[PDB]
Nucleic acid binder design. Sequence first.
RNA 1: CUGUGAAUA
Length: 367
Amino acid sequence: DSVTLQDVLANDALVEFATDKNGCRFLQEHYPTENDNDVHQKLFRKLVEDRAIFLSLCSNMFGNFFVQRVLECSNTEEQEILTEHLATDLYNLCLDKSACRVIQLAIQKLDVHLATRLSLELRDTHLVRLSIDQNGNHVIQKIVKTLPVSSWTFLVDFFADDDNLIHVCQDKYGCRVIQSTVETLSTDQYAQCYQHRVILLRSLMAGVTRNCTQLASNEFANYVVQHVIKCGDALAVYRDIIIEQCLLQNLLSMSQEKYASHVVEVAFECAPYRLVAEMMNEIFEGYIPHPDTNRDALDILLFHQYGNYVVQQMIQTCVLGQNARDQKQSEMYGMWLEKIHGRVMRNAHRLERFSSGKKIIEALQSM
RNA sequence: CUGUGAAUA
């Protein structure tokens, strides 16, 4: 209806419609996408003429959907006006439940130079608070997943400090921020500068690697350590350091913990032969507590509520490892599997009383 | 006796 559009335009009623659910649904459906349309131009001008009114509509539970529709149809001249408004209060808008959705769509829809100009407003702000915020963590992940890495180099510089990295990575929301950044930096962004990406990648990988023992044991940061272990190829130096300078010394203790046992499982699942052999050599020939009770680490892990899952992964690694083309490797994988199988047979009646022991017995009886 | 991770109508 055009009477409604002219009443919004002539009688200054845009705030009344945009802050009402059905009024704002009207504004989204009857906003013409064409930038040369006259109704489009006057409604856009009404939205952006007052900076404080524009920002209040971004933060409004219904008004933010209209601002999003204007972003979807925007051109360069409109985008420069929207960017200048959003830049005056960007950090607070990223914390807001409504306005952070406007920011996330603007990162997607603005021209890359304008979206970069927005994200550079975050450069000297409290980025720990933003990365662990329930709303702000999605803005950071959107920046990292959308813009080229040169638009957010300051984020990697911020996470280069070990205090910042540990605080963000050990958070329910901030571990998603760290993992998304690792995913983007370790992905082949072939249309961007290779060496710029790899320098940032190695700075963040070294940060995780320097703190790997604390992060692997943490409720949230253990996912990030698992991801670093799986990367390999040019990042294999970080996987090798994490296994050899942390996991090899701590394998038995980590396998008994709720979070770190997932890191041990991933290492057995994905590490190459040389590292798997060193991990098996720690299990069967390393430091064994109470050796008058325990023959090796299997005597602890077989009956443990988390360590039994490490044993199940060890079985699966050896079963697949017997197919190795190198008969020297497959001989070892078969001998580790026979050692596990003999220990399960010796303790079968105790193991049969538990769901863990039944799963281990069924996996071995499948062969 | 089975074991872990996100914000709008």
